[model samples]
Target: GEIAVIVKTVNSTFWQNVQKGADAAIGKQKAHTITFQGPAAESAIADQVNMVENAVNRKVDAILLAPSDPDALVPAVKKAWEARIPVVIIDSMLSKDAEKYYQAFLATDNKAAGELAAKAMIQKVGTEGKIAVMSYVAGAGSEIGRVGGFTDYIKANSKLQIVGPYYSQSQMATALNQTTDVLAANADLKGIFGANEPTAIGMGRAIKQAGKAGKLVAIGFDGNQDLQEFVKDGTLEATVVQGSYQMGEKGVDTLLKLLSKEKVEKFIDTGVVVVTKQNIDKPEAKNVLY
Candidate 1:
């Protein structure tokens, strides 16, 4: 039997870490092979859909996917169910109508993670100033929850004005350029939040390039090595960390359970952490900071 691990894109450290977890899980089991693939960009919804469809065509024992778009991937997942190949979705989710198509889901409580990021921003920069949102993939499940959560919380709890939720397509260079443009345009910005891995890296670099490091409240998502540097250098105030590794590890394990005719939880919250300079050294932060 084989387990196909298809993420939004294999380009990111976040998803690659998920791959590593998948590898580890399969390695430990020694009963199945892991087939990992994805689109080059998270925004490539069509490509992602095709990947899922191909996985179905190949008839892998199970599919572990971090779906790129909620709507576009539903039919592919439904087809998997029709084919009797169990699916365990990781990270983002498909639309509500597609719930029965998958056997289990695993991910952070992204909305809560987003709300926490906003709360941190308000605390750092106070509640009454302009904030910039450097976001990635406009309607992505994670973006919808993470950026939307941040924006909604800021609006309800503070007087902070939000600016450009510019979609970066999950490219660091694009994020860097967009963030630079944003910095150049807004002189009084009290804070900024980069809502994913590469976007955060770009945002951090742009903040540094503009000589604004540690000058304002800056928050980012996903703690990769680069983001760790940002936290160390004060380029980022803190980053919302997700259990990306756990998603893959637990996702495969859950899929295996389903394949064995064992009941599994319909949804598993892998969890999140707000990594800061102070707590990044602790085990709780270290657990998710890869």
Candidate 2:
């Protein structure tokens, strides 16, 4: 059988880590891997949709996509499904109906991951003061779910006030620019939560450049080395870590299983872990990918 695996995501250190995991897994099956991405790290959704459509046109065996927008990518996914190509939605989720077209969803439990990040911040801040949130695309369901979970938890249990929640278009420069202004405006801001690695590290750099290193606390999602370094240096508090490699490995395995007439679950949840200075070098930390 001619087996080809298509992997797609916005280009970033985090997605690169996803690619590494996918590469390792695909190598295990001796399958061909086709990794595609938007033109740049912060490329637009339209570009991602076009990428998926092109992959469908090529008639790949299976596609693993980290969608730009949960709802906007449905039509592309549907087109692939109609062509009888298996699509595995990853990282982000789409509308409920979208699940019917895709074979399965393999991703971190983003909402719970957000909750974990926020809870850690709350504990560090000691139940008071303000926090800001920096994120990738504003419309992405995964980002929304993570922010929603984090904010909801903070809103419910503590005196932590959300001063400002900012959205970056997944651009490191945009995050840096926004962080410069946000930190300046919200001088009393106790912490900032970044939804992904790029924004997290970019915002951290902005804080450091603006001479507010120890003044503003930071928490990031994804276990990129930069974020870990910040945590180690005590400039950042922690990161909500996801097992991207496990998600990739299991996702491909699940897809292959489904293709073989095996039953596959509709949902698979890769839980999150809190990575702080305390465990950055621990063996357990090796499971985390950016």
Candidate 3:
């Protein structure tokens, strides 16, 4: 069987780890050939749509997809459904209206991850000061769930004042600029949570450049080398690390099961962990770091 795995982008270390997992699964399956591709960035919705459409046209046995935008990619996914291709949605989700187009969803419990970050932020900043959230693209399902979860948690669980949930379009420069503006406007800002890898890196850089690294509590999502250094150096206090590799590997495995006419769950949770300096060095953390 031939499987097409479409991720958001290959430039980020997080996606590279996902690719590694997918490749490992392929090697284990032995009978399937997988073609993995994505756009230049997560914001490239149209490019990913084209990739999905092309894969459908190629008539592959199955598809494993991480949609860049939940709603924008529905038509392309519907095309796959029309062609009788079983698609295993991974990492991100499609809109509810588009749910009938895919076979199953396999990814992190993103909302819970965001809630974890919010809890960590509250622990560091306490319950009185103002905090903000840095978000990626608007229509991205993962970013939406993360930001939503954080804001909801803050509203219900703490007395802290919430500021802007600024959009960065998943660009590092945009994140830096928006974070700089946020820092400038919110003079009493005590903490900020970044909803994704690029957003977190951008916020970390901006905090370091502004000489507020140690003073302000920053929480980020995802585990990358730069983020780990920030955690070690005290720029970023903590991060919620997702099981990206497991999502990839399980995505392929689930698709293979579906191809064999085996039953599979409609949703599969990959899982997440909160990584702070105190526990980052633990042996158990090693498996989820990437």
Candidate 4:
């Protein structure tokens, strides 16, 4: 059997973890071969759509997809379904209308993860300080859920002033620029929530460059060596780390099970954990850190 594993991009450490998991699963399932494809950048929606169409044209047995945009990629996914190629959505989700096209969705509980970040930020900043959000890309399901979770949690749980959720297109420079501008405009800003790896990296760099590393509470999503260091040094107070590798590995496993006529859940949560300096050294925390 052949499986097409399409992601948003292959440029980040987080997605690299996802690819590693998929590779491991492929090695275990010797009966199948997998091809992974995506755009160079996560913002390339049309390119991602085209890749899905190409996969469909090639008549792959199954597709494992991480949609770049919730709504824009629906038609492409629907085309694969029409071609009788079963799809298992990974990392991010499709819009509600597109849910019928996929056999299962395997990823983190992104909304809950964001809410956890929000709680951490509120604990550090208190209820009255202004906070900002750095968003990866507009209309991306993961970002949408994360931003919504953070904002909604703050609105319901605290009186913290919410500032811009400026879009960064998952580019480090763009996120840094946005973070710099937010810092410049809000002299009393007390915290920030970065919704993805690039956003978190850019935000951390900007905070360090502005000499405001410890002055403000920084919370971000995803974990890498740099982010782990940031949390260790108190540049970022905490971060929500998703099980990206498990998402990929389970995505392939579930698709294979479905193909084998076995029962599987329509929705699978890979899970998330909040990593802070206090618990980062623990074995359980170390397990989820990418």
The model with the greatest lDDT is 1
For all predicted structures, in order, the TM-scores are 0.98, 0.93, 0.97, 0.98
Give lDDT tens digits, candidate 3, residues 1-290. 68999999878888888888888888986778888898998889899999999999999999999999999999999999999999999888899999889989988888888888888988888888899889998859887788888999999989998888788888888999999999999889999988889999999999999989888999998898988899999999998888889888888888899889999999988888788899999876778886
lDDT values of the candidates?
A: 0.91, 0.78, 0.89, 0.89
lDDT of 1 by residue, 93-195 (tens): 7789998899888988888999999999999898888999999999988788888889999999999998998999999999999999999999998899999
List model 2 lDDT by residue over 209-244, tens digit each.
999887877888778778888888887888888878
Model 3 regions more than 4 Å off: none
> Each candidate's root-mean-square deviation in Å?
0.8, 1.9, 1.2, 1.0
On lDDT, who's better, 1 or 3? 1
Best by TM-score: 1
Off by over 4 Å in 4: none
Angstrom error of the Cα, residue 144, model 3: value is 1.7
- Per-candidate clash tally: 0, 0, 0, 0
Worst-scoring 10-residue span by lDDT in model 3: 281-290
Looking at model 3, residue 141 earns an lDDT score of 83
